[PDB]
RNA sequence: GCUUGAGUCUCGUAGAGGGGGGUAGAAUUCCAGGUGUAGCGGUGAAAUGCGUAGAGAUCUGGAGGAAUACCGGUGGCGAAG
């Protein structure tokens, strides 16, 4: 057990899925959550509720660690980035700053070709 | 015979013009290790598929291949490609 001022989060937030984890500053995972393990299942796993309940859930789960003044970070182009820390926010961590990152390749290699619908 | 076409010499200017050799950063994948955990992925909707042998997430190190975000253009160079 360990109580922990400035905790980092992690959003990960996919097209069909946001996961969210939260561990120390040095990346060892205190708790984490998912839209899939809410409940929901397949097209409603992508709605920004599903993400809100998420992160209320995984905040419930890590409540027991004395996170306060947290850190967080948003990855990925989903929905619902937005949601995810008004929820934080909601849940009671004191939210002291926010990053945004998200990959960029610099014209690394191919990706997948277009999809014909 | 002549200098107006054509060509040679002197001084400068711009350019993804070509051939050879080095090197750098970002990203995908694989491998090893740390945290910890029951989902991940995909779709109109699903299923096939991956996960307790420890996945997906997150942090550290390594391997290898390929291509050069922004500048970037309404831009430039080449006989054309
Ligand atoms: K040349
Ligand atoms: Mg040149
Ligand atoms: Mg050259
Ligand atoms: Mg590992
Ligand atoms: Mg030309």
């Known amino acids: 057990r360990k109580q922990v001022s400035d905790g980092v989060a992690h959003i990960h937030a996919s097209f069909n899925?946001?996961?969210?984890?939260?561990?120390?500053?040095?990346?060892?995972?205190?708790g984490w959550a998912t839209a899939g393990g809410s409940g929901f299942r397949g097209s409603r796993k992508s709605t920004p509720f599903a993400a809100q309940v998420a992160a209320e859930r995984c905040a419930d789960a890590?409540?027991?660690?004395?996170?306060?003044?947290?850190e967080v970070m948003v990855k990925g182009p989903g929905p619902g980035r937005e949601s995810t820390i008004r929820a934080l926010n909601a849940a009671g961590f004191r939210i002291t700053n926010?990053?945004?990152?998200?990959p960029i390749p610099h014209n690394?290699?191919?990706?997948?070709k277009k999809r014909r619908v």
């Open 62 to 70: 890590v409540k027991e660690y004395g996170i306060k003044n947290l």
């Open 17 to 30: 899925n946001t996961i969210v984890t939260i561990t120390d500053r040095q990346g060892n995972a205190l």
């Open 108 to 112: 690394g290699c191919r990706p997948p």
């Open 98 to 102: 926010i990053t945004d990152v998200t």
